[PDB]
């Protein structure tokens, strides 16, 4: 019984590969060759957020593009006024082994998780005037890798137990479980419409899941090693992945395959974080080589470099208005680039 | 700056001061990482908050020294995914069941259990993150090993072992075998103790080793060691 089903799976995978190859008409290099290059991008540091005492593991911009939250291994969640450099909130964590943090797209809640296998939701707008823990989502077997608010009451998490989970925060129960990944899920990215989301895991594959139907819509397999970072194109029809094979990749949802590879001989280290520019023309990636690279997403040539982190660049994010970039690194500093 | 801008600046300054006092308070604790292969007796060491987290933290105090001990057994992923989080601990306490060198009780080449203990020790001691972190090595179950070495020899897992089957000789052979896995003997120390479960010398030994580690860290941070 097992032999027949293995053979059927082999035929199905072969037919998927054949359909993908038949769909591949022309690369995004020949039909983007007439595009003028962006040239040399020169972004300068405008702000330096000091105050974390251990390395920074995650940061997230608020939707107003002025407030941001960072998570550090000193057990602390700090909200920063990117404009004045003022720190608005300092939230102590019951577990200092934090790995992810999210900012609700209303400003009222923050989330954080890590090696405790629990996603803690903190209320930022309380009548008593201090940040208090709103809920603790428990049920993941492994550590929390990423979390993203769908809404004030819905949150999607990825964990090292090889599953993602959609949680209704009002009750503390996961409404949906997303299974199918073989390795630990490292990264998560929500579509701008929040109908779909994409996740990268240690099996070197990315999966697109329908949040409502709770099933895997598609699978993308081009990377040679673990996928640490994933990000949606602003259109919502493409996403970029960053792996530790020193390569970033671009995948189209409608074409169901990979479009472009962002790599260089001088680059040997793996990607920690990826993000797009407001129009999606530039792709920003942070590396273990202590800096970030700005790629022309259409032409796959390196447009610039954001060298400003004595340690590995662990997180990076672009504002909603596209004005500035934020990089958090293992040297305990946050830098804002214009 | 407006009045409200000034007040927000003052609030940010207050938060900064509180962060620095919290960092000073947190720097006072000696943080140790517990490690050991399957059924190595690290539970009986830690007995000498968490549901499935595998980040079990034990805080205690010995002779005015604050210890935070982190047990990471419940995490079922590869260590490469979370071991970098512990780059910066004062020491790694590695527990090895001395009396378990015949039974398999794990995936193994032909027949051993000390092989995976050696492999884990080699992977941990020789690691990018723990380049200078010291190891406190505990060799548990000395009496069961005594009777085992009386009934069975070390050869079935130590082919190069020579000398009469005695407790001290076999125990020192385990000493040497585990302590020679170090490849940077000029950078980090190994503190090895034969766990006397009938005495309180295990915690005293950890205290002495941690005191030595603290002194060495201070001295080599200023170029004196």
């Amino acid at each position, epitope marked *: 019984e097992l032999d027949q089903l293995r053979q059927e799976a082999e035929q199905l995978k072969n037919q998927i590969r054949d359909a993908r190859k038949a769909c591949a008409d022309a690369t995004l290099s020949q039909i983007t060759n007439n595009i003028d290059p962006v040239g040399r991008i020169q972004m300068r540091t405008r702000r330096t957020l000091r105050g974390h005492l251990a390395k920074i593991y995650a940061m997230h911009w608020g939707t107003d593009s*002025r*407030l941001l939250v960072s998570a550090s291994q000193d057990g602390k969640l700090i909200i920063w*006024d990117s404009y*004045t450099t*003022n720190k*608005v*909130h300092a939230i102590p964590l019951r577990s200092s082994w934090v790995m992810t943090c999210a900012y609700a797209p209303s*400003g009222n809640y923050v989330a954080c998780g890590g090696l405790d296998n629990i996603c803690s939701i903190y209320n930022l*707008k309380t*009548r*008593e*005037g*201090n940040v208090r823990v709103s809920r603790e989502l428990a049920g993941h077997t492994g550590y929390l890798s990423c979390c993203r608010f769908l809404d004030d009451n819905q949150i999607v998490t990825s964990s090292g137990d090889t599953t993602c989970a959609l949680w209704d925060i009002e009750t503390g129960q996961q409404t949906t479980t997303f299974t199918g990944h073989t390795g630990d899920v490292m990264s998560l990215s929500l579509a701008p419409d929040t109908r779909l989301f994409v996740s990268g895991a240690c099996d070197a594959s990315a999966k697109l899941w329908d949040v409502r139907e709770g099933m895997c819509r598609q699978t993308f397999t081009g990377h040679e090693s673990d996928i640490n970072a994933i990000c949606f194109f602003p259109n919502g029809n493409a996403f970029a992945t960053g792996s530790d094979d020193a390569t970033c990749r671009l995948f189209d949802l409608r074409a169901d395959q990979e479009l472009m590879t962002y790599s260089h001989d001088n680059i040997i280290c793996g990607i920690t974080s990826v993000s797009f520019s407001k129009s999606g023309r530039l792709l920003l990636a942070g590396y273990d080589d202590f800096n970030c690279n700005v790629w022309d997403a259409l032409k796959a040539d390196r447009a610039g470099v954001l060298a400003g982190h004595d340690n590995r660049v662990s997180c990076l994010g672009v504002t909603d208005d596209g004005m500035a970039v934020a990089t958090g690194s293992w040297d305990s500093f946050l830098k804002i680039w214009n | 700056l*407006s*009045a*409200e*801008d*000034k*007040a*927000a600046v*003052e*609030r940010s300054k*207050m938060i900064d001061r509180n962060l620095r006092e919290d960092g000073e308070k947190a720097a006072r604790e000696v943080k140790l990482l517990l490690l050991g292969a399957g059924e190595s007796g690290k539970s009986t060491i830690v007995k000498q908050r968490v549901k499935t987290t595998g980040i079990v933290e034990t805080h205690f105090t010995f002779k005015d020294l604050h210890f935070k001990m982190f047990d990471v057994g419940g995490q079922r992923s590869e260590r490469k995914k979370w071991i970098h989080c512990f780059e910066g601990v004062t020491a790694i306490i590695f527990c090895v069941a001395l009396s378990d060198y015949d039974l398999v009780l794990a995936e193994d080449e032909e027949m051993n259990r000390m092989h995976e203990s050696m492999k884990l020790f080699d992977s941990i001691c020789n690691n990018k993150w723990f380049t200078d972190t010291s190891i406190i090595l505990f060799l548990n179950k000395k009496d069961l090993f005594e009777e085992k070495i009386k009934k069975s020899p070390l050869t079935i897992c130590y082919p190069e072992y020579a000398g009469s089957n005695t407790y001290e000789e076999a125990a020192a052979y385990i000493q040497c075998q585990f302590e020679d896995l170090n490849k940077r003997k000029d950078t980090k120390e190994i503190y090895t103790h034969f766990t006397c479960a009938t005495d309180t010398k295990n915690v005293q030994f950890v205290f002495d080793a941690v005191t030595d580690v603290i002194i060495k860290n201070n001295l080599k941070d200023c170029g004196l060691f």
Partner: single-chain antibody, 230 residues
């Protein structure tokens, strides 16, 4: 959240008195505190401010040298020591909590007040009392001596409401933001030196005195007060 005042009464002129406020239900130490007096005949008047952490302290020009504001954080208490009290110091004294960070709402909660019996921005109310009926829309105007819009891009104008027999309650902060728990029928608008508060579909419980205050700089200045009655 509760702020309870105590220490009022009858004091002979030239004497001393101590007002104490007890705070409960909120993190007292992270809030700045204001003492605000209101005479039995006129409207509100800012008296003093102490910052969270006991840093800056501000006094009104008429109380400087005589009054002293302090706070005991472990006991969650706010103290006002007044000496050499004159006949002009008889008023109801309120304690206001006000927290300051990006996006906060200062002057959000007020105490019940205690009764004691013995350059600068000018805020002008165009009307002192207008007649209204339930179900209608009313507009209240306030004028500033100088522009309350700052270079940082926000206008430091606040609208408060005092219903008959209770302490003032925050309505609008920064000239445009609706306070928490306030019905979505009030709207603040305008520009520098000219502000309007509009109530659409008014009814009972809205009658009372509306005040406009500036927070551009110290001393904080209130308006004369516009009264809405049936």
């Amino acid at each position: 959240v509760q702020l309870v005042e105590s220490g009022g009464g009858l004091v002979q002129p030239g004497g001393s008195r101590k007002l104490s406020c007890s705070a409960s239900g909120f993190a007292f130490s992270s809030f700045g505190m204001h003492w605000v007096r209101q005479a039995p005949e006129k409207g509100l008047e800012w008296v003093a401010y102490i910052s969270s952490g006991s840093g800056t302290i501000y006094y009104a020009d008429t109380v400087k040298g005589r009054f002293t504001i302090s706070r005991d954080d472990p006991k969650n208490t706010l103290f006002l020591q007044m000496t050499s009290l004159r006949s002009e110091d008889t008023a109801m004294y309120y304690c206001v909590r006000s927290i300051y960070y990006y996006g906060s709402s200062p002057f959000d909660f007020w105490g019940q007040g205690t009764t004691l019996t013995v350059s600068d921005i000018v805020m002008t109310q165009a009307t002192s009392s207008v007649p209204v009926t339930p179900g209608e829309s009313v507009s209240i105007s306030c004028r500033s001596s100088k522009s309350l819009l700052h270079s940082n891009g926000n206008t430091y104008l606040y609208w408060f409401l005092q219903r008959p027999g209770q302490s003032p309650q925050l309505l609008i902060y920064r000239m445009s933001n609706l306070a928490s728990g306030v019905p979505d029928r009030f709207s603040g608008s305008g520009s520098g030196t000219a502000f309007t508060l509009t109530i659409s579909r008014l009814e009972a419980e809205d009658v009372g005195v509306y005040y406009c205050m500036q927070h551009l700089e110290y001393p904080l200045t209130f308006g004369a007060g516009t009264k809405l009655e049936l």
